[PDB]
Design a protein around this ligand. Structure first.
Ligand code: FAD
Ligand code: FAD
Ligand code: WO1
Ligand code: WO1
Lengths: 588, 588
């Protein structure tokens, strides 16, 4: 058991010191390593319980049983006297840079997961390269380092959501005594984009600074894995070369899909293009019904747009469907139009985009309803939000041996290892895992620790909480209600639920029984909380804290015995009592 | 064990049915009680662990071992046939209504805890009276049913806090693209107060309707306990009379204190007066430094007031003083002025309140600083927030025998019982317990269930979470840092902390390193989270969820292994890593 850990640790670590906090000879080596700017991992044997068997098992590698012991890339380097001899002889530098490979680690993809993994491995002395390239979109849109969330996802999405929310704040202000008149105030699209892009640029710059400050090589080039240790790179001048690394981490993400209909690629856009568009979209058609589609439609409507969503079948496929419909109902009652059970057939161009005067074009959209009836309407912009997909054929020579699943995602063990023993995958291309930025970051940090510092902790991908940032927000953690019933039967499931009204909505004259929350519990397991759900303001701040208690196995009684904070929306979870089986109304 | 529960339950319950879900003879009796519109508790014996030993023990009262059995106020009434004999002969009404006292329960005080206890008791068949009266303030202010939170506390305070927050929304909206000019917008105090009071009056009426629809007798009168079972009441014409009850719950709350200085009562106001004041206070002095004082000073400045706070020693005594100082630093930097280490000596009247044209008066305030230097300045309004106290000499005849503590609060056991065996106390007047509305509500509901439905659950008063609703809010659960150090020793305590910036603050150009959070952990107990602290927006909604995880014994590892929701402020708790012992900066 313990011997197989020591072997794995010694072989992949780049520079590692085995040590004890009590021994001063270890401090003499530590101090020498610090002075020479030699980054390394350290393992203090007098802090692990099996540390006396580890000191014994070390002798299998060094033929000695004492500390300190310094290793470099699987080879024992020496004890106290031997390291000092190399220092004063000007030999230690070339020792610690001895490698069969150019890099200890090559990361392909400069996004949420890739940046996190690369920064963490460098902290333990691993020589690291991070590659990032942004394939432009069909109209040419491109952006800087940091990946999808930073440039064309969570960060600009939530900023624009926030600009939408501020419209209600101006409305509410009057009722609380302020003198403004909401009807006389308008929104400037390009002023908001300039402010959003300014912040994104400060994030691009910050990431390049952090890689320099960590000694990570940043190459703005497209990477391709041609053999288990060989990565082929193409740069901005189309110049091609090959670099080698010991461990490879794949982290290249996904890009938006287009439907195979005429005019879609030529005349539509995606979210990739939306967050830096020079003109207001104007009258917009959003095709799709994911959170991307609903979040985008939602804030375009609050910013004054004329917005329609085309729904093939259901909203928010994969989420609790009772919550999904309430999410949709609220949008439909607050200025978002819906074309239900409908799909597009072609986009025709009526007006080219006025690039000079900074205006959108004009398009004719044709489709049909599921009963055969026809759809025909004019829009200035057409946004496709019909899913996302990787394209690993552009990253992975097929002869390398990395297995993929049916959707083109990498099949991994629970320690992120692919079918090639030294190649790993993280983030959105890791098959079957939630596609979320906090997940990618955690997965990448923990893997760096396992590869280069002897760590053993795995990433836990179960019960990861979400928030859909629609005009009225929706936060969730755990199973949907229909999933829980499917898994245990209707008779073993109890559901406590209630409406509520945020106190901020009283004086502003907003709806009495629209916000809603529920807890889905398992009778036979002590009324364990299988899933939590809440529709309301600040739904992400509400939900997050509860994810810790769900991780710990919380029950209805744990909620019951905790006291609420008053006045908040979230305290409603601490006094829930109406069950669905009771048939009692949940209104307040 | 079991017998002593059954003796207490039968002796205390008003109407209680010992039943089974399987035996249809019980459904026969339940229907009779439903149609006869008779409310009662029910102890289904097939759904309890030792439900088969209770059945055998029930024969000590009835001499039968079978089910159903119905009791009224300790007396056994009959089985299936005997109860249907009383229903047929129309003898059932007078048998269920016969009591030694006027009521099964008299609640003195119609506030958070009192209204809660009463409505819950009447569910289980208790004949219940709720007394409430509002002693006017020195300048005559008065209000309706619901207690301190509803009328002069949490509810109007947070509403006015929200009007204050809306001023930053107006400022932010420009940077997000909206075309208003915050510089040209002003606030109307009396328009705000009308909105606030209209909501309050809708809650007064709501509570009265709820009491009627539960068959609870509501008397708008002053109650004095003169014997263990006798309450003397005085109505609006000072008509005295006496009613009697089996159980008595004291729940009369507190009122604001005044300092013993000339002019205070005459020319100052308190929070009791602030929330329905018919004129804007104008240039204001707030004397004190509790959460009441800081919350009020905070929203007055945001509404454009000229506000000064006079602090005797420290801000927010009893709270984590690092967080308190950050709270106050924020206020001092955003337009609240502080006069530090200073007390008042006298309030002189320069102008009487212009009650005609709706204008404040004018006062001169004289006081001195702690070194000896003098203070003298003119203000239009002076508000005292120097603590609150109960006045139980009004409520309680000393001959009855209810023991008070040195502060004037009621000494109770862990199930709220006073030193007189049938008299209980809940809420703020219960000595040593947290003075919070959700605590009073839970205590009152759980007690009603123990008195009249045979429940055993006690109220857990440990680790109750709070939120201070200052301009930048401060949420907390568990111990302060200085209290954990004192209890366990500096060497056993580790503190993880970090600054953060809300994403909403980036485009708005707000401060980078003002918001702040920390986890106070005990090393030797597995890094157990002793206390959580966060300063930032929506701090009540951030903190609430974590109160559950803390009740369940959460450790630092439980936080680490939970994944964040992105982008939120709350997710920063899931990746904390900078310790105070390390000396590394917590900036972002
Ligand atoms: C509109 C939108 C909103 C979202 N909102 C949220 C949200 O609120 N919360 C949340 O948790 N998640 C959100 N997501 C999802 C989130 O963006 C992803 O889960 C996350 O970015 C995945 O990170 P990653 O490292 O796996 O991939 P990425 O962040 O996409 O990084 C991969 C990077 O590698 C680059 N690359 C690709 N091929 C190569 C190659 N051959 N060589 C070099 N570099 C290459 C890509 O161009 C990219 O820069 C949103 C997504 C979208 C589209
Ligand atoms: C400005 C302010 C802000 C606050 N904000 C918050 C907050 O945000 N969150 C929070 O949790 N707590 C808050 N509190 C505290 C909270 O209001 C109290 O903890 C809570 O009201 C206590 O409830 P209670 O039932 O014990 O007493 P109360 O709610 O005060 O009810 C007692 C009632 O009994 C009446 N009464 C008194 N004597 C008699 C008598 N002899 N006969 C008949 N009736 C009588 C009183 O007039 C009153 O109606 C705040 C308090 C103040 C002053
Ligand atoms: C089950 N329903 C049938 C209609 C289509 C889809 O619902 C919507 O598209 C919707 C609801 C609110 C706003 O849009 C799923
Ligand atoms: C420890 N300090 C001493 C000065 C007085 C008191 O601090 C304040 O009164 C204060 C700080 C920010 C705004 O006000 C406690």
């Amino acid at each position: 058991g313990t011997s197989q850990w020591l072997r794995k640790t010694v072989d992949s670590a780049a520079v590692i010191l085995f040590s004890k906090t009590t021994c001063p000879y270890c401090k003499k080596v530590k101090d020498v390593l610090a002075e020479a700017k030699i980054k390394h991992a350290t393992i203090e044997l007098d802090q692990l319980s099996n540390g006396s068997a580890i000191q014994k098992c070390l002798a299998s590698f060094s033929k000695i049983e004492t500390v300190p012991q310094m290793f470099v890339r699987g080879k024992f380097i020496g004890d106290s006297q031997t390291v000092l001899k190399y220092y004063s002889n000007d030999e230690l530098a070339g020792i610690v840079n001895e490698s069969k490979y150019d890099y200890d680690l090559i990361v392909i993809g400069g996004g949420s997961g890739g940046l996190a993994a690369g920064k963490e491995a460098a902290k333990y002395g691993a020589k690291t390269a991070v590659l990032d390239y942004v394939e432009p979109t069909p109209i040419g849109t491109t952006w800087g380092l940091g990946g999808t969330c930073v440039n064309v996802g969570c960060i600009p999405k939530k900023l624009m959501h926030q600009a939408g929310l501020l419209s209600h704040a101006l409305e509410d202000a009057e009722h609380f005594g302020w003198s403004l008149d909401r009807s006389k105030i308008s929104h400037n699209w390009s002023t908001m984009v300039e402010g959003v892009q300014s912040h994104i640029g400060s994030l691009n710059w910050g990431y390049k600074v952090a890689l320099r400050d960590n000694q990570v090589t940043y190459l703005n080039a497209k990477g391709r894995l041609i053999s288990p240790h060989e990565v082929q790179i193409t740069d901005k001048n189309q110049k091609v070369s090959t670099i080698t690394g010991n461990k490879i981490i794949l982290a290249t993400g996904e890009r938006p899909k287009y439907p195979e209909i005429p005019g879609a690629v030529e005349y539509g856009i995606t979210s990739d293009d939306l967050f830096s568009l020079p003109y207001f979209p104007g009258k917009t058609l959003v095709i799709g019904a994911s959170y991307v589609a609903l979040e985008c439609a939602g804030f375009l409507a609050s910013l004054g747009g004329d917005v329609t969503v085309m729904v093939r079948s259901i909203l928010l496929r994969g989420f609790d469907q009772q919550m999904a419909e309430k999410v949709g109902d609220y949008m439909e009652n607050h200025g978002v139009k819906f074309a239900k059970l409908c799909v597009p057939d072609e986009i025709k161009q009526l007006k080219v985009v006025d690039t000079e005067n900074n205006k959108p074009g004009l398009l004719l959209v044709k489709g049909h309803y599921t009963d055969g009836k026809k759809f025909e309407e004019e829009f200035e912009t057409v946004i496709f939000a019909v899913g996302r997909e990787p394209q690993l054929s552009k990253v992975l020579c097929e002869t390398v041996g990395v297995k993929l699943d049916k959707n083109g995602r990498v099949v991994c063990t629970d320690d992120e290892q692919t079918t090639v023993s030294n190649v790993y995958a993280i983030g959105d291309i890791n098959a079957g895992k939630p596609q979320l930025t906090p997940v990618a970051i955690q997965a990448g940090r923990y893997l760096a620790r396992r590869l280069f510092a002897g760590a053993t902790e795995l990433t836990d991908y179960s019960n990861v909480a979400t928030t859909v940032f629609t005009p009225l927000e929706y936060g969730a953690c755990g199973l949907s209600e229909e999933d829980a019933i499917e898994k245990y039967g209707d008779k073993d499931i109890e559901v406590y639920h209630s409406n509520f009204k945020p106190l901020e909505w009283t004086v502003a004259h907003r709806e009495d029984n629209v916000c809603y929350m529920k807890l889905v519990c398992r009778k036979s397991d002590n009324m364990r909380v299988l899933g939590l759900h809440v529709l309301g303001p600040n739904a992400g701040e509400i939900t997050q804290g509860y994810a810790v208690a769900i991780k710990m196995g919380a029950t209805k009684a744990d909620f019951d015995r905790t006291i609420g904070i008053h006045p908040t929306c979230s305290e409603t979870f601490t006094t829930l009592h109406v069950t669905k089986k009771s048939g009692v109304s949940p209104i307040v």
